[PDB]
Every structure is written in C-alpha cells, then in structure tokens.
Design a protein around this ligand. Structure first.
Ligand SMILES: CCCn1ncc(Cl)c1C(=O)Nc1ccc2[nH]c(-c3ccccc3)nc2c1
Ligand SMILES: [Mg+2]
Ligand SMILES: [Zn+2]
Length: 315
C-alpha cells in the first residue's frame, strides 16, 4: 500500500482525459498501466510483484507488428480506465479487476492478420476456433500466462470469483471481434430505445461491456487529429501486408487491404466513421453519458477526413 505509483505533472493531469496518448517511451507504459490499476481498482486489488511479472510476460507475448502491438494494448486499457473513472458507481469489484486486464491481453500474440486471412490461408487456428479465431487465441494466451508460476494475479479470489473474472475477461476479449459488434450494437440500440436495457441483467451487462470493448479498441479515432492520422498509417501498414498475402493466395483483397487503392484511404475512413465509429460512440454515449468526449472527438476527426477529401488537409 505505502509504495504508490506516481506520474509526472503533465501525465498525472492529462491521463484523466479520454484523448490522452501514452507517448513513445515503451519503458513508461508498465508504470502507466499499474497507476491506472491502483486508481481504478485499488492498491490492494493485486500483489505488485505478481502484477509486474504478469505485465512483463504479456508484453513479451505481443509481437513487433505495426498496429496490433504492446502500445495498442496499453492504449486500449487507458481508454477503459477513462470510462471506468467517469462511471465509477456503475461497475463491480470483479469488473474493475477483470476489464483493465482484459484490455491489456485482448490482442495477445497478434501476427497482423484478420480472422478472414487465417481462414483463406487454412492456418491451424482456423481449424481449432471456427469463429472469432484470433480472439479465442488471445484468450487462450491470457490463460497460459495466468497459469505461469508466480503469475496468478487473481490468487486471493475464491474459486467461484476466479471463474467469474475469467468469464468477464473471456467475453470482453471475444467482443473485440468487430464482426460481433454490428449485432451487439443493434441489440443495445433497440434495448435503449424501448427502455428494456437493465444493468442488473447479467446478459445486458455482457452487451454493454462488449460495446465498451469496441469503443476502447477503436479509440485511435477519438484522439487529437495528429495522433488519429499517424495511427491510421500503422493499421494500413498491416492491412496492405495482408492484401499482399491474399494476392499471393491468388485472391483479390477487399479495397481497404489493397495498397494500390492508397489514394482512396480518406474516403474509406469516412465510410468507416459513418458505418462503425459514430454509431459505436453514439450508442455508448446514450448508455454512459460521461463517455461524450469520445463521440465529440470522433465527430471532430470525421470533419478532418472530409477536409482531406476536399484537399484542404494532406495525408
Ligand atoms: C486505425 C484507423 C481506424 N480504424 N480503427 C480500427 C479499424 Cl478496423 C479502423 C479502420 O481504419 N477500419 C477501416 C474499415 C473499412 C475501411 N475501408 C477502407 C478503404 C480504403 C481504401 C479504399 C476503400 C476503402 N479503409 C477502411 C478502414
Ligand atoms: Mg483484436
Ligand atoms: Zn485491438
């Protein structure tokens, strides 16, 4: 308890903002994550030694890929931290414990390829997990790490509590499969607009946490423009590599993965904000009003992409 994590003055202030960027110093991200855990969960939620050992084994099992990397893991966790701090009365002890950990682990051992490439490639993981292929792999990787000697960060929970928290994490990680988002958000929009949404309903909680996980996972669209623009370059570096690999299989890639369609990125972004991002943050804002700043920043970046299309901005 008496060893408390502290951040420099700028970080201490700005980490509370939804649009906080965790910065380029890799060696500071473990400290940043522990701080967010101590403040959102509590200093006694975890033994510091085990948490640190766990954090470092998770980092080791993320790969050196352009976007789906350790920095994305901490970025997604930070967005969850801001949502939990601005809605602190709405979540349980086990949910605070589970959710920052789920966010850190959500893309474990990502190779930079979609579930669809793994299917067309006939990768072994597509045989093992027929849907949410990579997401079932991320969870499996989370369990492996939790089961390493000195890594049971949930060692003080009862058997039944340990099982609840692993189930929170499992559901949260699976919800990051964007193919499941479309259904989940439609269900939540209906439930909100008929007044049937009920946070005491566990199946409704599950859906809200899923939407929170989508929001956190896409949160690059909720940063200041310079962050948003530079992060878009990182995901296309992955998408275009996948499109190359599709071409090697004799398959025409979809437009977002073809590097020859590079000049159409601003319009692809516009399409993505209109069909996915805006609806996502819009629905989340209705259920959790304090998440408003994510929707605001998502709208600001939509205007930036329109300015790029009109040739008033470059990218
Ligand atoms: C990091 C940046 C935003 N982002 N966060 C998560 C995820 Cl997925 C995305 C994201 O960018 N998704 C996305 C979805 C559909 C798209 N269609 C096109 C496109 C491109 C060229 C020609 C025609 C179409 N680009 C796309 C990008
Ligand atoms: Mg993922
Ligand atoms: Zn992700």
């Amino acid at each position: 308890g008496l060893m408390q994590f502290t951040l420099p003055v700028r970080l201490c202030k700005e980490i509370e903002l939804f649009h906080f960027d965790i910065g380029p110093f890799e060696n500071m991200w473990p400290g940043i994550f522990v701080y967010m855990v101590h403040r959102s969960c509590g200093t006694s939620c975890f033994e510091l030694e085990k948490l640190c050992r766990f954090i470092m084994s998770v980092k080791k099992n993320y790969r050196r890929v352009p976007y789906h990397n350790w920095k994305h893991a901490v970025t997604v966790a930070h967005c969850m931290y801001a949502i939990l701090q601005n809605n602190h009365t709405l979540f349980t002890d086990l949910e605070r414990k589970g959710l920052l950990i789920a966010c850190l682990c959500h893309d474990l051992d990502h190779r930079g390829f979609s579930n669809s490439y793994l299917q067309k490639f006939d990768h072994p993981l597509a045989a093992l997990y027929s849907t949410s292929t990579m997401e079932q792999h991320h969870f499996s990787q989370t369990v492996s790490i939790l089961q390493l000697e000195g890594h049971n960060i949930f060692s003080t929970l009862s058997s039944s509590e340990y099982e609840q928290v692993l189930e929170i994490i499992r559901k949260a990680i699976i919800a990051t499969d964007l193919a499941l988002y479309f259904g989940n958000r439609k269900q939540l929009e209906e439930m909100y607009q008929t007044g049937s949404l009920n946070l005491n309903n566990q199946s409704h909680r599950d859906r809200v946490i899923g939407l929170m996980m989508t929001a956190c996972d896409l949160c690059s669209v909720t940063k200041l423009w310079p962050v948003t623009k530079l992060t878009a370059n990182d995901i296309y570096a992955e998408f275009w590599a996948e499109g190359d690999e599709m071409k090697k299989l004799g398959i025409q890639p979809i437009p977002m993965m073809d590097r020859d369609k590079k000049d159409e990125v601003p319009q692809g972004q516009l399409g993505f904000y209109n069909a996915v991002a805006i609806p996502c943050y819009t629905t989340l804002t209705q259920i959790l009003p304090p998440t408003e700043p994510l929707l605001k920043a998502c709208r600001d970046n939509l205007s930036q992409w329109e300015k790029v299309i009109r040739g008033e901005e470059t990218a």
